[PDB]
Amino acid sequence: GPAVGIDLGTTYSCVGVFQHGKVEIIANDQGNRTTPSYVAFTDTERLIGDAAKNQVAMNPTNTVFDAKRLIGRRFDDAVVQSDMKHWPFMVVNDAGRPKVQVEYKGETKSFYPEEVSSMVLTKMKEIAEAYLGKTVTNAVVTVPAYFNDSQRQATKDAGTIAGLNVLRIINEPTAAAIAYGLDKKVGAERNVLIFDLGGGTFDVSILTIEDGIFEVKSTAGDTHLGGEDFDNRMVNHFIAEFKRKHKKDISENKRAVRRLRTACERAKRTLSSSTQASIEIDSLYEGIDFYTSITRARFEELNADLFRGTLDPVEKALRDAKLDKSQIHDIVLVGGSTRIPKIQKLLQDFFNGKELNKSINPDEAVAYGAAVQAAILSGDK
Ligand SMILES: Nc1ncnc2c1ncn2[C@@H]1O[C@H](COP(=O)(O)OP(=O)(O)O)[C@@H](O)[C@H]1O
Ligand code: VO4
Ligand SMILES: [Mg+2]
Numbered sequence: 109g110p111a112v113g114i115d116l117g118t119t120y121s122c123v124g125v126f127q128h129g130k131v132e133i134i135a136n137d138q139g140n141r142t143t144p145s146y147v148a149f150t151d152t153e154r155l156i157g158d159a160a161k162n163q164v165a166m167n168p169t170n171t172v173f174d175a176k177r178l179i180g181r182r183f184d185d186a187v188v189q190s191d192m193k194h195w196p197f198m199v200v201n202d203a204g205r206p207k208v209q210v211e212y213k214g215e216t217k218s219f220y221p222e223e224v225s226s227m228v229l230t231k232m233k234e235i236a237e238a239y240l241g242k243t244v245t246n247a248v249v250t251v252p253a254y255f256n257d258s259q260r261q262a263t264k265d266a267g268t269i270a271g272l273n274v275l276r277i278i279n280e281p282t283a284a285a286i287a288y289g290l291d292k293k294v295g296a297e298r299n300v301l302i303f304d305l306g307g308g309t310f311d312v313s314i315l316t317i318e319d320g321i322f323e324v325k326s327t328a329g330d331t332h333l334g335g336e337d338f339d340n341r342m343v344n345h346f347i348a349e350f351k352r353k354h355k356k357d358i359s360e361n362k363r364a365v366r367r368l369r370t371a372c373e374r375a376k377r378t379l380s381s382s383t384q385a386s387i388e389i390d391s392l393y394e395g396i397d398f399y400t401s402i403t404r405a406r407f408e409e410l411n412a413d414l415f416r417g418t419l420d421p422v423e424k425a426l427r428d429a430k431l432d433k434s435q436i437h438d439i440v441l442v443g444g445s446t447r448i449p450k451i452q453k454l455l456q457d458f459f460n461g462k463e464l465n466k467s468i469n470p471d472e473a474v475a476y477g478a479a480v481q482a483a484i485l486s487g488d489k
């Protein structure tokens with residue numbers, strides 16, 4: 109059967125298949141090549157992906173995300189206790205293990221992180237089956253390099269619960285380097301820097317690849333820095349604007365803020381390919397339309413400290429790997445946020461003009477590599 113690669117991401121998931129010599133990243137029901145890592149529980153149904161994210165403002169306590177922050181962890185973990193303060197859904201303690209508790213079909217139900225993640229994997233599985241016209245069973249699923257065995261095991265368990273046969277759990281930076289065939293170059297060792305800025309996390313990884321061995325020399329970053337923060341800065345910018353223009357503070361209107369956030373995330377993506385973007389929202393608040401624009405320069409300015417700051421973990425990784433900048437053979441862009449021109453310029457400048465590996469859509473590069481690995485492990489490459 110066709111073996112697939114699945115990036116089970118903190119904020120977005122992505123599924124690819126290697127067939128007939130190339131990787132095809134598979135579009136979902138709405139034609140989207142990534143799917144939000146969201147699950148929602150209502151009076152009648154369980155929603156996964158876009159459908160779940162789309163109704164978050166109307167059903168916030170029963171809409172679950174960030175399961176990857178809980179997966180493989182214990183309830184009393186300092187990380188878990190800290191993150192819980194920021195989620196609108198309830199996390200409870202079941203004999204040491206955290207569970208998300210929600211209302212579902214009129215009943216109180218609780219789910220382990222790997223159960224929530226299994227639902228996301230089910231959706232990714234169904235997405236591949238919709239495209240392929242065939243049952244999909246075998247998969248390679250990816251995780252951050254820093255994941256321990258409990259986290260790796262729970263992620264595997266998520267796959268099993270979804271009916272996936274998990275061929276192997278591989279590291280995200282390894283998937284990215286495989287995508288670019290950086291293990292297959294004629295020569296000795298290659299030093300590879302993976303610069304991965306996603307929706308919720310920032311990961312820098314330095315790999316030394318030789319004889320099929322992907323030695324992790326160092327990792328660095330920020331588990332709470334991603335595209336979400338850039339959207340936040342934009343949202344705050346426009347809330348302030350609306351306040352000045354209309355003498356209204358829309359802050360506590362969850363639906364209004366959500367529609368603004370949606371518009372902001374969209375404008376941000378647009379600004380990666382254009383120097384300006386329109387914000388167009390009918391009846392944002394009290395039937396007041398919000399039609400405006402934002403320039404790439406203003407988006408950059410709003411986020412300047414955060415963008416520049418990404419270079420600090422790059423320096424930390426280099427010193428921990430005992431390598432000079434000039435000793436890096438390949439630099440790889442991973443994660444949707446690395447599409448931002450300013451971030452690319454900052455990194456290329458930091459490496460004194462060195463070209464970046466970015467031809468593969470960075471939000472798809474992890475799935476791409478996982479798909480290649482899946483084909484290898486199923487004997488189809
Ligand atoms: N063209 C783009 N420009 C800027 N940001 C983007 C673009 N496309 C996607 N993003 C952002 O990338 C983030 C998601 O990254 P992704 O790698 O897909 O998921 P994850 O963080 O779960 O691995 C989101 O913040 C999203 O808004
Ligand atoms: O799913 V990630 O937050 O490791 O890019
Ligand atoms: Mg990612």
Ligand code: NA
Binds near residue numbers: 116119121
């Ligand atoms: Na992802």
Ligand code: NA
Binds near residue numbers: 305310311
């Ligand atoms: Na990341």
